[PDB]
Amino acid sequence: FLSLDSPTYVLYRDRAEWADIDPVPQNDGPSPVVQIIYSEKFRDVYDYFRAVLQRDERSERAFKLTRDAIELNAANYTVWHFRRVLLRSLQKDLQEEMNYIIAIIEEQPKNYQVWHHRRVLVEWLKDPSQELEFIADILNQDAKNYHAWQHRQWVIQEFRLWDNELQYVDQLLKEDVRNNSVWNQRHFVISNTTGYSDRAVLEREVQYTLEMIKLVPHNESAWNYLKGILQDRGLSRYPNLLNQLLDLQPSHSSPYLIAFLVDIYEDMLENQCDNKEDILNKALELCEILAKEKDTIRKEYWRYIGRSLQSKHSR
Amino acid sequence: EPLYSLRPEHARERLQDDSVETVTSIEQAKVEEKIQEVFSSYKFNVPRLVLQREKHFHYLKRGLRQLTDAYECLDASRPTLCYWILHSLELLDEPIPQIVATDVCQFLELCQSPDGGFGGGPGQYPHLAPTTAAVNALCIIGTEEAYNVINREKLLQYLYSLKQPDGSFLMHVGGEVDVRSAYCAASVASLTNIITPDLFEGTAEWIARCQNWEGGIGGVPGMEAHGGYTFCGLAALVILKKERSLNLKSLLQWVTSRQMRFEGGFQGRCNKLVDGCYSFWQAGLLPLLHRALHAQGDPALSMSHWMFHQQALQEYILMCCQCPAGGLLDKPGKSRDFYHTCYCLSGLSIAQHFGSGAMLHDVVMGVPENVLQPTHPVYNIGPDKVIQATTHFLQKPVPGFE
Lengths: 315, 402
Ligand SMILES: C/C(=C\COP(=O)(O)OP(=O)(O)O)CC/C=C(\C)CNC(=O)CCCC[C@@H]1SC[C@@H]2NC(=O)N[C@@H]21
Ligand SMILES: [Zn+2]
Fold this sequence. Notes:
The complex is a heterodimer. Chain A has a single domain, classed as Alpha Horseshoe (Serine Threonine Protein Phosphatase 5, Tetratricopeptide repeat). Helix content of chain A is 66%, strand content 1%. Chain A has helices spanning 40-55, 60-72, 77-89, 94-107, 112-125, 131-141, 146-158, 165-175, 180-192, 199-215, 220-230, 239-252, 255-270, 276-294, 299-312; one strand at residues 35-36. Chain A is elongated, with a radius of gyration of 29 Å. The N and C termini of chain A lie far apart (81 Å). Helices cover 45% and strands 2% of the residues of chain B. Chain B has a two-stranded antiparallel ribbon. In chain B, strand 2 (353-356) and strand 3 (359-362) form a beta hairpin. Chain B is globular, with a radius of gyration of 21 Å. At the A-B interface, strand 1, helix 1, helix 3, helix 5 and helix 7 of A face helix 1, strand 1, helix 3 and helix 4 of B. Strand 1 (35-36) of chain A pairs parallel with strand 1 of chain B, so a sheet runs across the interface. Bound molecules: ligand GBO and zinc ion. Chain B: Pfam families: Prenyltrans.
């Protein structure tokens, strides 16, 4: 009805249709701390909000008021609670409510409470039809929005909507291959659909991740994905791998390549392979390269990996 | 020649995009651009690093008492503001006057719900975030007046009311679930001595389902790893004494990788941006890991240093995160706030102070007056306050009991 930015806006305390109700001032006590000197609009709205909450007035005007209280402070979880009580009481049209919560999310995409609200509507309606497209619009503006991804995973898992998700993942990877949220989603889809044991699948995946690594050797996300698929099973299970990486090194050689090699040698020593005291040296030569030249921010981490290999793989 | 970020070999830590530009790369290059300026300024036609204590103090002092309407959007986070301000005063070593302590108490008392926990403000419904913050604050005050504000029976019911079959906790009634809520329940339950045999049943297993393919922990199973959820995950397990549930080796590989080779700070997740408050959420994981590998005999641990470049983190916080007006920031050209003032400081303290068994070894960049008071990495209040409170609540029985 009467929006907060309208020239004609009138404080609740001057609205005739609120005349029966006495507003309830906040109780901060005699000498408060972290006291906020609220604007006039804000304090007026919340003075009336407290009066309806306290009387437990389940009314239409109470409902229109919550909208204002939210517009002023969208993180007041108490106000969102009350609004849901009114949608149940007044039996409001929940689809109208979907339209409301979409606008607000577009306006404040990083607020927890707005997404929680949206999900409760979806649980109520049992209707996922708009979710994936809505989420895709927000993701178009912020491709890393944590809450949007969280909502997407919840919608997919819940209403089993897995069938197009990999194509979505692939579209986004093309747009920005450094988006770690997308690499995580790729893994989320695969691990819940086909699994990573279908050797055909684990091949296409490993093939693909190296293809990306070739285009962009210094993109950490891919290296973490490669490691994270193969690490399940043990890297020494894949003998071609050591040498295929050693072939990338004179050109494509990030500090991630070096660290992967250390992870491979680490797994070999752990499986009792041939050349124990040889390989334990190629490893330590990298630890020292990293700690001392190619990755010194992590000097302490690598000196500790060095001292772990020695302490484990000697006599 | 002694400052790590100003050495000439450091120019090499700049981003290599491999000639393939994306949004991610463009943004990372822009920050590295700004941060370069800040560094080439400190050297110009030598000087030291100073933590602007008086300026930070005035900002804090004033905020604890009163706030403009710019702060309307924190009207459901007041106890949380209290905690941010008291923790920073406590770190900067500033005695809290008794009439301030007393006012804080009576205030938190008006936030306390009659069915337990605290809400964001007087007469709001309870929520776990302001509940941990209120309890933490009362501990920082550390008196009997404060300790007695907490209604332990009602706290325990409230917590049961949030507990789910599958081990997790709601943030608030009808609220959502994530790992933060488990940390909060574990933090408050353990300082006030209200853990019952079944309260955390299933909880440590729920947390571990949240550890993902990257090594870190995400907010709920399936989600990307993030510094804030990871810290809560680990720390809640350290409280429950179930660190072993997690794959600590992958967790270590992950966090150490979140220190940024150029800026010196931490990002919160991979391929994102440096941010001052990750100085605590990410770097405070290293003390937790150190004490966990140690209680399993790891003999390769250091006894001078945590497993991050402490020097380079300190240089990031002192040169890039300080507002000349007072208070601290995410990164240069942001505007200050109390949340970043609190966590940049909590992280500076951690990068300053090593402790393990009987080892202690400090590292204080810039002037020696920069030293802060130590912080307890589980609870992020002072180690004495933690002890004092646990001890005091251990005198009463768990409720529903003797
Ligand atoms: C949605 C999200 C991050 C959003 O990331 P973003 O894109 O906005 O930024 P980024 O690019 O990921 O850095 C999750 C991360 C969570 C945290 C940064 C914070 N973790 C917590 O707040 C822990 C909650 C525990 C409550 C206690 S109460 C006293 C203390 N104070 C406080 O603020 N929290 C704790
Ligand atoms: Zn931050």
